[PDB]
Amino acid sequence: QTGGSFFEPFNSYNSGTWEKADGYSNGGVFNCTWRANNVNFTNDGKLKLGLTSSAYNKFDCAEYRSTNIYGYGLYEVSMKPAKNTGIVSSFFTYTGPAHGTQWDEIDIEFLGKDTTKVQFNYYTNGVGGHEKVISLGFDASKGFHTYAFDWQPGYIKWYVDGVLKHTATANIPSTPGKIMMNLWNGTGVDDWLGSYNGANPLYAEYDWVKYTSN
């Protein structure tokens, strides 16, 4: 029994809750370097992640993650992804070898090439391939909506504005992980994300995050 239920409205910063990625790159398909200066807190209480450029063809992106780890329960987020070919805005749980565990993760990803859809996925002991793309019936980039997943031992249920949209029923992840949010441009995955055209700055915003334990 790991982290407890919490509600994060992003109104002020206190130690022991979150951390910014800074100064290194995830490498691989991630074609940008994380910068702390790209994670900003607005005065009206939003977490704003930016994708910017320093110099020609050099991109800086952003990632914010919890310091504690959290297990089964309901994860909800009110967010507004960026819209642009070649990028991703996300909300996901994650644990892996860096944390000394197997790779388990549950994702909500908005492919910026088409923000009228959302991609749900998950990895269990490093096995992925569960991508499910759902049509939202609206352009998520235009305003805030609530996205959520209920993660229980026998299923993952994802919801959009409170409506059940997808249910996964096998090989569900079991290792508590950190809550993460990131915005990045890829390379090497044009088929998935579209080609990134260098447009910047781009922002994804998060108004709140809530986790309710069992």
Give the one residue of 4, 9, 198, 201 binding Ca ion; rule: CB under 5 A: 9
Q: Taking CA 17 as the corner, what is the angle to CA 11 and CA 20, rounded to the nearest 5 degrees?
A: 85
For Ca ion, the binding residue among 148, 207, 209, 211 (CB under 5 A) is: 207
Residue from 3, 10, 185, 186 touching Ca ion (CB under 5 A): that is: 10
Q: How many residues at the interface with Ca ion, by CB under 5 A? A: 5
136: left (phi over 0), alpha (psi -120 to 50) or beta: alpha
Among 4, 28, 45, 153, binds Ca ion (CB under 5 A): 45
Among residues 125, 87, 120, the alpha carbon closest in space to that of 106 is found at 120
Note the residue count of the chain: 214
Segment 164 to 193, residues that bind Ca ion, using CB under 5 A: none
- Closest-by-Cβ residue to Ca ion is 45
Neighbour-count burial of 145, counting CB atoms closer than 10 A to its CB (0-12 exposed, 13-18 middle, 19+ buried): middle
Tell me whether residue 61 or residue 209 sits nearer to Ca ion (CB atom).
209
Do the beta carbons of residue 205 and residue 80 sit within 8 Å?
Answer: yes
Tell me: does residue 128 bind Ca ion (CB under 5 A). no
The smaller minimum CB distance to Ca ion, of residues 114 and 207, is found at 207
Catalytic residue among 63, 76, 109, 205: 109
Catalytic residue check, 131: no
Specify whether 19 is catalytic: no
The C-alpha angle with vertex 49 and arms to 131 and 119, in degrees rounded to 5, equals 10
Cross-strand partners of 66: 18
Q: Which is nearer to Ca ion, 116 or 212 (CB)?
A: 212
Task: Give catalytic residues, as residue numbers.
Answer: 105, 109
